[PDB]
């Protein structure tokens, strides 16, 4: 019941590298930011070459909301699939960190965070309507992106300060919070996406 794309394509395509990278940059520039983070940038990105696993659980007629999406903005089909990603998606995010333990505006730090080992588990429905394609996710959201290894690189001169590492942690879990917020607001039920 497997979907085994030898998805070699994306390990080489610059266009989706800079389309997901550009989408992430765009997401960084628009969101309201805390005071302890100065700038957010996607220094690097790579989707990797480990395909997520998919199983077709069911396949029925589409639900009554997709047609609403049509008439707002016959003989179709929708799939109930099970989506699992334990692969090798890597993101590297540049960030300037206003560090303020002794006094306010004490320092501005060059920082680079690594989002890696991203695990992801949920159910999904994909409805094509000859041939408009629509995507939506089933699990409750946020906590769907359960696995994430975000490790932070700072300067060697500030590695031993726990006061720095506190701000580092706050930036890390804020990035976690807006990560889960992004995926839950973009894809979780009811919300659904057109043109994949």
């Amino acid at each position: 019941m497997s979907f085994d794309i030898n998805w070699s394509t994306l390990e080489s395509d610059n266009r989706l590298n800079d389309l997901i990278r550009k989408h992430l940059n765009s997401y960084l520039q628009n969101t309201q930011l805390p005071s302890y983070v100065s700038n957010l940038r996607v220094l690097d990105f790579d989707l990797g070459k480990v395909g997520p696993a998919i199983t077709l659980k069911e396949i029925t007629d589409p639900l009554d909301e997709f047609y609403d999406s049509i008439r707002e903005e016959p003989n179709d089909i929708q799939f109930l699939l099970e989506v699992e990603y334990k692969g090798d998606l890597l993101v590297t995010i540049g960030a300037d960190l206003v560090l303020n333990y002794p006094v306010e505006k004490f320092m501005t730090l060059p920082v680079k965070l690594s989002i890696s080992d991203i695990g992801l588990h949920s159910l999904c429905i994909v409805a094509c309507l000859s041939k408009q394609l629509f995507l939506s996710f089933l699990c409750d959201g946020g906590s769907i992106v359960r696995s994430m290894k975000i490790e932070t690189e700072i300067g060697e001169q500030y590695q031993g300060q726990g006061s720095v590492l506190r701000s580092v942690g706050e930036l890390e879990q804020f990035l976690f919070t807006i990560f889960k917020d992004f995926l839950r607001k973009e894809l979780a039920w009811p919300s659904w996406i057109n043109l994949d």
């Binding site: 019941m1 497997s2 794309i5 998805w7 994306l10 396949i59 094509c128 041939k131």
Partner: protein, 220 residues
């Protein structure tokens, strides 16, 4: 105009009245028909002939077919071991024609195993583009057919839209049948069926010459 008078001369000189005459048994028809269809079945060649014919009908058009499907191969094909049975043969005036032409009206029922084995994939775009389309072995069958048929005379015949068609579909994907499969197959099947063979769309087959000629005489 007054060519209904000719229909009246036919009905008068044929021991027949449209409102009073009863239906006819028509079993000899089923006997000779059974002989012919058994002859077309016993030919081991027509299996590959219509395997080929179906693949050729698939190749010409991939447009009217749902786009989430890929390429379509037939690996299984069975014709059956039973025969069709006709009964209730009537004669009525042609509708909407103000009583122009005549037509027989034969009921029809058939029960057997009519199968075909499909093997398809399910593509989606534009990720990535081209998806890892999962495979489907779709063995589809028909078991019963009841219809109310109209024949007249080249050949003229078609079906009443209130016909019975009963299907029997199975599919394996990787290692479990699914109903939407059989519903889709039903859609396309009855699409071709009603497109070419149901009222108000008839089929006109050329009528050959039956008069004795010397180039049509054999013996044995």
């Amino acid at each position: 105009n007054e060519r209904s008078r000719q229909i009246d001369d036919i009905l008068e000189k044929t021991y027949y009245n449209v409102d009073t005459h009863p239906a006819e048994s028509l079993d000899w028809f089923n006997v000779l028909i059974g002989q012919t269809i058994q002859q077309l079945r016993e030919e081991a060649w027509k299996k590959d002939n219509i395997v080929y014919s179906l693949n050729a009908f698939i190749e010409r058009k991939a447009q009217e077919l749902p786009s989430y499907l890929d390429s379509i191969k037939i690996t299984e094909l069975d014709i059956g071991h039973d025969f069709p049975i006709f009964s209730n043969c009537r004669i009525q005036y042609s509708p909407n024609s103000n009583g122009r032409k005549l037509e027989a009206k034969i009921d029809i029922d058939l029960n057997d195993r009519l199968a075909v084995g499909i093997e398809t994939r399910l593509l989606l775009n534009y990720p990535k583009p081209l998806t890892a389309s999962l495979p489907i072995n779709v063995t589809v069958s028909i078991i019963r057919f009841q219809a109310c048929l109209t024949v007249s005379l080249f050949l003229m015949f078609s079906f009443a839209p209130e016909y019975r068609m009963e299907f029997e579909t199975q599919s394996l994907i990787g290692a479990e049948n699914i109903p939407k499969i059989g519903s889709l197959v039903e859609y396309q099947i009855k699409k071709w069926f009603v497109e070419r063979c149901v009222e108000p769309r008839f089929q006109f087959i050329k009528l050959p010459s039956v008069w004795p000629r010397s180039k049509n005489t054999r013996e044995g």
